[PDB]
Structures are given as structure tokens and as C-alpha cells.
Design a binder for this molecule. Structure first.
Ligand SMILES: O=C1NC(=O)[C@@H](c2ccccc2)O1
Ligand SMILES: [Zn+2]
Length: 256
């Protein structure tokens, strides 16, 4: 599976029939239809003890991985019941600044989208959590192109060392707090992984406020390769799934 004409999102359902399921992601967020849910509890993003370990080009994106062997970096509150542990983050981005996000907002595409992936500790490990309807919480953050995000530059600067699929590099001491916007206002809905295996195990929490990154920062994302070393170069761009049918779901807002 990949993002090309012959193996991209329109093909995924043949190997992964849940691609046509009842709670697939991403979705378009219609901001006028989303309803404030006065009942949602405050959201709690607690990343002070986050322990990054490694960055990996997996052929689909690059993942910054964390040590999730203890409650260090956790997401709580909001729509969530219990505690969700950060395991990795990654991005989806475009070939041009006018596309790249997975979620859209009133059909607007952002230049990229950051996914901070967390698993519900009540299920013990990530592989068990993805088999549960409430196994994961993904915090999604839009990227627009404008001012540079200083907290992103350490990620940007290591990408030269993981250009191709299967390459990894040590990436300790990276603070994901530097990737968050000021506001934690969000939309939330029940959905899925946005790549195979497309499992319907995710509570999505999508922040309303984008972060700004510079054109130079995102241009370096676009120099990565989908291919492995020594193979014909295929730039890693447009690694996003388009919006999927909302079906029987409501998107809730944390704000008025
Ligand atoms: O929202 C998602 N972005 C992805 O790449 C996908 C996902 C796949 C596998 C593990 C964790 C997340 O689901
Ligand atoms: Zn993702």
C-alpha cells in the first residue's frame, strides 16, 4: 500500500475492507455543524517527562518515537476516559502548500497535519489497544506555512540522515511541547487510523489553532523519499488520505 495511483487510498479497501467502514478517518470538519459539548472535561496534555528515543523513515512518513514503558507523556481529559500514553508522532504533508492535511476544516486543506499518537493504558500495550474501539487517542494539529516553528527545527535538521525508507537515527531529548499551539480548543469524533490497517480504534482530538511553520521547514519534509536507499527516487509528498464519509457521527467542539 502507498499513496500512488496504483496503490493509494482508492485501492486500500481490497486488502483492508474496513476502509469502507462506519467510522473511518480523516473527515471534513464542518465548523457550523459541530456542536459545543459543555460536558467535555478539560483536556490535559502532560508532556514534561516525555522521552524521545529515535526517528524512523518507515516509507510512509517519519515517526519520532518515545519511550512508552512508563507513564511519562500522557493525554487525559476532554472526551477521554482514563490515561493515554504517547508512543510516537509523525506528519502528513503535501507537494504544495495548498494540500497535505488529512482532516479538512470547511473543506480547507492545510499544508500538513501532525499526529501525536497515544494508547489507552488500560489495554497494557499498543498492539492490544488498537483492537479496541477506545484504544487510541490521536491529537491532530494543523500546519500552515508562514513563520518558522522553532520547536520543529531539530526534527527538520535530522531528516537528511533518514532520507530513505528503513533509515533511523537517534533522537533523544526532543520536547514535543514545542510543537503545540497556544490554544487547546478542539473538535473530537470517533474514527480510525488513516493508513492501513485502518482500524476503528481512535478517539480523534483535532486542535482548532494551527501552528505555523516556514516554507523552508516544509520544503525539507518534501526532500524525504518513499523509496529505500539505492532505489529510484520517489519524493515523500502527498502522504495524506482524503476525507471519508462522516456516516453516523457527530463532531463535538470543546469551545463556543
Ligand atoms: O492517524 C493516523 N496516522 C497514521 O499514520 C495512522 C497510524 C498507523 C499506525 C500506527 C499509528 C497511526 O493513523
Ligand atoms: Zn497520521
Amino acid at each position: 500500500w502507498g499513496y500512488g495511483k496504483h496503490n493509494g487510498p482508492e485501492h486500500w479497501h481490497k486488502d483492508f475492507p474496513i476502509a469502507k467502514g462506519e467510522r473511518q478517518s480523516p473527515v471534513d470538519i464542518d465548523t457550523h455543524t459541530a456542536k459545543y459539548d459543555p460536558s467535555l472535561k478539560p483536556l490535559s496534555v502532560s508532556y514534561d517527562q516525555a522521552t524521545s528515543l529515535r526517528i524512523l523513515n518507515n516509507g510512509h512518513a517519519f515517526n519520532v518515537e518515545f519511550d512508552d514503558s512508563q507513564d511519562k507523556a500522557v493525554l487525559k481529559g476532554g472526551p477521554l476516559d482514563g490515561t493515554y500514553r504517547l508512543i510516537q508522532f509523525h506528519f502528513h504533508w503535501g507537494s504544495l502548500d495548498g494540500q497535505g492535511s488529512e482532516h479538512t476544516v470547511d473543506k480547507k486543506k492545510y499544508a500538513a497535519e501532525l499526529h501525536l499518537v497515544h494508547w489507552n493504558t488500560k489495554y497494557g500495550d499498543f498492539g492490544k489497544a488498537v483492537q479496541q474501539p477506545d484504544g487510541l487517542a490521536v491529537l491532530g494539529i494543523f500546519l500552515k506555512v508562514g513563520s518558522a516553528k522553532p520547536g520543529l527545527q531539530k526534527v527538520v535538521d535530522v531528516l537528511d540522515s533518514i532520507k530513505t525508507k528503513g533509515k533511523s537515527a537517534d533522537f533523544t531529548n526532543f520536547d514535543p511541547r514545542g510543537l503545540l499551539p497556544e490554544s487547546l480548543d478542539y473538535w473530537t469524533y470517533p474514527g480510525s487510523l488513516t493508513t492501513p490497517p485502518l482500524l476503528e480504534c481512535v478517539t480523534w482530538i483535532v486542535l482548532k489553532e494551527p501552528i505555523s511553520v516556514s516554507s523552508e521547514q516544509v520544503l525539507k519534509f518534501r526532500k524525504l523519499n518513499f523509496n529505500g536507499e539505492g532505489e529510484p527516487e520517489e519524493l515523500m509528498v502527498d502522504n495524506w488520505r482524503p476525507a471519508q464519509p462522516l456516516k453516523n457521527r457527530q463532531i463535538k467542539a470543546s469551545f463556543k
